[PDB]
Amino acid sequence: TSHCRFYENKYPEIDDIVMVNVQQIAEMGAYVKLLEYDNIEGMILLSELSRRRIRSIQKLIRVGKNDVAVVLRVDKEKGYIDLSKRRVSSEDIIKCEEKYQKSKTVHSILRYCAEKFQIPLEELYKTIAWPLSRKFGHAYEAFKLSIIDETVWEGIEPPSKDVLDELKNYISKRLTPAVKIRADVEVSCFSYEGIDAIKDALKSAEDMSTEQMQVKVKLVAAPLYVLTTQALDKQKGIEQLESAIEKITEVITKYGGVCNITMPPKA
Amino acid sequence: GETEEEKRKREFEEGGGLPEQPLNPDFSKLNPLSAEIINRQATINIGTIGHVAHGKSTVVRAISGVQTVRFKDELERNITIKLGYANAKIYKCQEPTCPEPDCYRSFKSDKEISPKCQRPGCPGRYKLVRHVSFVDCPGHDILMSTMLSGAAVMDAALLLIAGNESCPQPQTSEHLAAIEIMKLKHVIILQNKVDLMREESALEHQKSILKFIRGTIADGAPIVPISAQLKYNIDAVNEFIVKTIPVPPRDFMISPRLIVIRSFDVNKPGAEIEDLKGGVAGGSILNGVFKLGDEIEIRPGIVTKDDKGKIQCKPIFSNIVSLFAEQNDLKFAVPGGLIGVGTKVDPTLCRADRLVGQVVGAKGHLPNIYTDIEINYFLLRRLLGVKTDGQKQAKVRKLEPNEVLMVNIGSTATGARVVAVKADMARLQLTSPACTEINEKIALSRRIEKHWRLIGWATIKKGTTLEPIA
Amino acid sequence: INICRDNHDPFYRYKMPPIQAKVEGIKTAVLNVADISHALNRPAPYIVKYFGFELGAQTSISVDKDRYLVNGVHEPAKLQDVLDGFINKFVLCGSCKNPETEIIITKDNDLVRDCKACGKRTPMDLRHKLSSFILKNPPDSVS
Amino acid sequence: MRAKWRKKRTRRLKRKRRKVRARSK
RNA sequence: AGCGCCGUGGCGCAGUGGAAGCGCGCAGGGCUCAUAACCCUGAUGUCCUCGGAUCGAAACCGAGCGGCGCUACCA
Numbered sequence: 001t002s003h004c005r006f007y008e009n010k011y012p013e014i015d016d017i018v019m020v021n022v023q024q025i026a027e028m029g030a031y032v033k034l035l036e037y038d039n040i041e042g043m044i045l046l047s048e049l050s051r052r053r054i055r056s057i058q059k060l061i062r063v064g065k066n067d068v069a070v071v072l073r074v075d076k077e078k079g080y081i082d083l084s085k086r087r088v089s090s091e092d093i094i095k096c097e098e099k100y101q102k103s104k105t106v107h108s109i110l111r112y113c114a115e116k117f118q119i120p121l122e123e124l125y126k127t128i129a130w131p132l133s134r135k136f137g138h139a140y141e142a143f144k145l146s147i148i149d150e151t152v153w154e155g156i157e158p159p160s161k162d163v164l165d166e167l168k169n170y171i172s173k174r175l176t177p178a179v180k181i182r183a184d185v186e187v188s189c190f191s192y193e194g195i196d197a198i199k200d201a202l203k204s205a206e207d208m209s210t211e212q213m214q215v216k217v218k219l220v221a222a223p224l225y226v227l228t229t230q231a232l233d234k235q236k237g238i239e240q241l242e243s244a245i246e247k248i249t250e251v252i253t254k255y256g257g258v259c260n261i262t263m264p265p266k267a
Numbered sequence: 268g269e270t271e272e273e274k275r276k277r278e279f280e281e282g283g284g285l286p287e288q289p290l291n292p293d294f295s296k297l298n299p300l301s302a303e304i305i306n307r308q309a310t311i312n313i314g315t316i317g318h319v320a321h322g323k324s325t326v327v328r329a330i331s332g333v334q335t336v337r338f339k340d341e342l343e344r345n346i347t348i349k350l351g352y353a354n355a356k357i358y359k360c361q362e363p364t365c366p367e368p369d370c371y372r373s374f375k376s377d378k379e380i381s382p383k384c385q386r387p388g389c390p391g392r393y394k395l396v397r398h399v400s401f402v403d404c405p406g407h408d409i410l411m412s413t414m415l416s417g418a419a420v421m422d423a424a425l426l427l428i429a430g431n432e433s434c435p436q437p438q439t440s441e442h443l444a445a446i447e448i449m450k451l452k453h454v455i456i457l458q459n460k461v462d463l464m465r466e467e468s469a470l471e472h473q474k475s476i477l478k479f480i481r482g483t484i485a486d487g488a489p490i491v492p493i494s495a496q497l498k499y500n501i502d503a504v505n506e507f508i509v510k511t512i513p514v515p516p517r518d519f520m521i522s523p524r525l526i527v528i529r530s531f532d533v534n535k536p537g538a539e540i541e542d543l544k545g546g547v548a549g550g551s552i553l554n555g556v557f558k559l560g561d562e563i564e565i566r567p568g569i570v571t572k573d574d575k576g577k578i579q580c581k582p583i584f585s586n587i588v589s590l591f592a593e594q595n596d597l598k599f600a601v602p603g604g605l606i607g608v609g610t611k612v613d614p615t616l617c618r619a620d621r622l623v624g625q626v627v628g629a630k631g632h633l634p635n636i637y638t639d640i641e642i643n644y645f646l647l648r649r650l651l652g653v654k655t656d657g658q659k660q661a662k663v664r665k666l667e668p669n670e671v672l673m674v675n676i677g678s679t680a681t682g683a684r685v686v687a688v689k690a691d692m693a694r695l696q697l698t699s700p701a702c703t704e705i706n707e708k709i710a711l712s713r714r715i716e717k718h719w720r721l722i723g724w725a726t727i728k729k730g731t732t733l734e735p736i737a
Numbered sequence: 738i739n740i741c742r743d744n745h746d747p748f749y750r751y752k753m754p755p756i757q758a759k760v761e762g763i764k765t766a767v768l769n770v771a772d773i774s775h776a777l778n779r780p781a782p783y784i785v786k787y788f789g790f791e792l793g794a795q796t797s798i799s800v801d802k803d804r805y806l807v808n809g810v811h812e813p814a815k816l817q818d819v820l821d822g823f824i825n826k827f828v829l830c831g832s833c834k835n836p837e838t839e840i841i842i843t844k845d846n847d848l849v850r851d852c853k854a855c856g857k858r859t860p861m862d863l864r865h866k867l868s869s870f871i872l873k874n875p876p877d878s879v880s
Numbered sequence: 881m882r883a884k885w886r887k888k889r890t891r892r893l894k895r896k897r898r899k900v901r902a903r904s905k
Numbered sequence: 906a907g908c909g910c911c912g913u914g915g916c917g918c919a920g921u922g923g924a925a926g927c928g929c930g931c932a933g934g935g936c937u938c939a940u941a942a943c944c945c946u947g948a949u950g951u952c953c954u955c956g957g958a959u960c961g962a963a964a965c966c967g968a969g970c971g972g973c974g975c976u977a978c979c980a
């Protein structure tokens with residue numbers, strides 16, 4: 001069951017930017033629900049809606065799908081929202097869809113957990129999502145850090161530990177991201193012996209592979225040797241491949257041949 | 268109840284198989300027809316020449332059965348740049364009761380010493396008279412240096428002409444004249460297209476061909492009507508090859524050498540490189556008895572330019588890891604056959620058309636690179652390969668100072684600049700390296716109508732040698 | 738596939754593919770303008786706007802996304818003939834009639850046909866609207 | 881009509897015939 | 906021989922973790938005495954073939970098919 005607004009409180013603040021799905025139009029416009037903040041209803045007057053001319057009303061309203069939203073005035077005493085679709089720009093739309101995805105993913109994971117446990121989903125956001133959004137600024141980034149670091153769940157009080165286990169398993173199953181760094185080096189040697197030099201250099205390159213990062217010097221051609229590594233954090237692969245580059249240059253600068261680089265390490 | 272594969276294995280075993288070459292035999296007694304040599308290498312090189320879009324490789328695949336790759340997506344259909352290599356074994360059958368013309372049988376490189384007689388009712392076994400290699404030269408107007416290199420490595424020739432097309436095909440004339448330039452008078456004329464032909468049309472084309480070859484150097488060349496697609500008149504060409512073409516003098520007294528025309532990097536992709544091979548250079552030994560594990564150096568080799576602009580050549584020494592000929596890895600190589608010299612050479616060095624027309628010498632000999640060479644040149648009266656629509660085939664003009672000319676010494680495709688032109692000698696400067704071994708027949712081509720045009724022949728007389736940097 | 742001309746029947750020469758038209762509501766999208774453009778060393782806008790010049794109707798041009806809409810009911814023959822007028826007036830040079838000539842501006846704003854085989858600077862018909870069109874967008878540098 | 885544009889068109893046609901003369905002479 | 910891309914309703918792009926998407930198409934209706942513009946409403950589909958993960962996978966992954974952009978003819 002979908003409830004327990006993703007953000008902190010029930011009533012949207014002033015000038016906060018949200019995302020609304022059209023639900024019902026009488027004459028004045030889109031008095032509809034929010035999908036980023038609380039699901040409380042809010043007015044959307046038609047003049048607050050259209051930048052172009054108002055030609056196709058039905059093609060424009062698009063009931064059943066989310067759209068941008070800027071809040072202008074809030075009812076904080078009985079509950080209503082003054083919300084608009086005119087105070088937006090494209091670069092604003094970008095962060096709008098960003099926040100849309102950010103809230104959707106956390107709602108999906110915690111809705112799965114609350115559906116499986118039959119534990120009221122508001123208790124899930126109380127016990128889990130809100131402390132993570134306090135520590136780390138957003139529960140999505142907190143889940144991403146949980147995938148690498150277990151410490152995020154310390155100091156936080158489970159409603160039951162099986163909740164922790166199921167959440168860990170599901171975030172590991174769906175939020176699994178490790179990026180491949182590949183480089184390309186031309187052997188341009190015109191010399192006497194390079195094949196044995198290639199043996200030495202590639203043995204040295206593959207021995208540098210760590211237990212968590214196995215660099216594999218694969219063959220795709222005679223000059224072009226390719227270098228692939230699975231960067232686990234995406235900061236050490238560049239220096240690993242730089243070490244391999246130093247190795248290849250140092251090997252071939254003495255036998256008499258020449259080697260040159262085309263593609264440095266890039267994710 | 269036996270599979271075809273089990274069968275083939277059985278009559279391969281019963282045929283004597285493919286025996287391994289001995290490690291160290293008596294070389295003073297070996298001939299190119301010893302059973303030790305014929306089973307695992309080709310001693311006669313045969314070239315194929317013809318007009319463009321004719322099907323030279325098709326006759327080769329009809330004779331042997333090994334395809335010529337025809338690679339590079341674009342070149343899968345139009346024309347290929349490198350040569351075409353295929354191996355054929357000339358099997359005669361020892362029973363004289365069967366007719367002579369169908370006695371001869373050409374088979375692939377994988378055939379046995381004595382496989383059964385395919386003619387229904389003959390219990391004889393084939394005896395291999397000789398294993399021969401086939402070089403499919405290009406047949407286009409731009410590719411000319413590779414053709415002339417193939418002719419230089421050719422020992423026998425096969426001219427191909429089509430019937431219903433126009434009689435005077437000038438590409439064929441250029442091929443035959445180039446073959447005449449490089450001292451080859453063993454040519455077999457082949458009429459490719461006979462099936463779509465009338466009885467009188469074939470006779471008229473034959474008369475035209477005979478009239479064509481009256482004033483050239485070659486006089487007594489046979490003509491054979493063969494069908495490339497119908498796969499017939501195969502035995503006739505083989506018996507003609509056996510009869511008319513003898514063995515050019517190539518014995519073991521002459522010093523060992525190599526002339527590389529093609530290069531082959533050995534970098535099988537997808538697998539780990541901890542199991543890798545060397546690099547193969549496709550070269551012909553026109554003279555020399557090369558074995559496994561010998562020192563060799565590529566004479567023109569590494570080409571570099573210094574800050575002053577001077578051309579420096581570093582001869583590429585290398586240890587031979589292996590020699591590949593015929594089908595099996597062989598211990599010692601027989602001159603008169605293309606061989607893949609697989610060496611510790613760099614993978615890039617043999618990648619592209621890089622070892623195309625270069626000269627290689629074993630340790631124990633010093634071929635000399637030259638920078639300026641004095642040539643003795645002779646030239647024809649009209650260019651060949653120019654279809655004049657009824658007007659006096661273009662008469663060739665005398666050479667001029669400071670002209671770029673494509674000079675093919677042996678196999679090297681070099682662009683020379685003219686320093687002096689005389690009545691019968693000339694002086695050439697090479698911005699690209701060339702080396703002089705003994706005589707090394709040369710061909711000359713000019714830029715007259717956009718693309719390259721052969722003009723005449725030449726021989727090296729003098730030259731300014733460049734001492735290699737150790 | 739055309740031999741790049743209309744009243745010209747060789748077997749050997751430079752090639753052009755025919756152009757066609759699909760319907761939109763109405764305006765015809767022409768599929769084969771970029772390929773002919775590359776076969777004539779002349780940008781697609783020159784093709785489309787010349788077709789319009791000899792035609793006399795509203796047109797839409799968008800080179801980034803391949804939707805070249807020319808408005809009107811034009812059977813294949815009519816637009817292939819207008820493009821034939823293009824190639825004869827523009828693409829082919831004087832002496833040999835080379836189907837690859839570029840459009841070049843010297844220090845003077847003399848828009849000129851320039852060839853490769855004969856290589857002359859064919860005196861261009863600046864007295865046409867496509868001349869002003871081409872001079873508006875310098876070739877391969879403002880497109 | 882707009883005799884403005886007709887006069888301008890006549891001037892332009894005269895200009896074009898003059899430049900054709902200029903190339904031709 | 907290997908890696909990066911893709912898998913349409915008639916076409917171009919897209920979100921691929923709530924299950925067929927819009928523009929442009931089209932059949933039909935609305936408006937106008939009339940046509941267009943416009944307004945609207947509807948019809949086609951096995952996000953490729955088969956599994957894992959999941960309440961559920963066109964979708965996250967995979968055990969492969971079909972096609973593409975490089976290495977480069979790689980004994």
Ligand SMILES: Nc1nc2c(ncn2[C@@H]2O[C@H](COP(=O)(O)OP(=O)(O)CP(=O)(O)O)[C@@H](O)[C@H]2O)c(=O)[nH]1
Nearest residue numbers: 318319320321322323324325405406407459495496
């Ligand atoms: N009618 C006929 N066609 C043949 C015959 N042999 C080959 N062809 C056809 O020639 C066409 C091209 O063959 P191909 O071997 O690739 O030509 P090529 O000799 O390599 C080109 P180049 O002469 O420049 O080297 C093929 O389609 C083949 O069917 C033949 O005997 N008769």
Ligand SMILES: [Mg+2]
Nearest residue numbers: 347350351403
């Ligand atoms: Mg060939």
Ligand SMILES: [Zn+2]
Nearest residue numbers: 830831852855
């Ligand atoms: Zn011209």
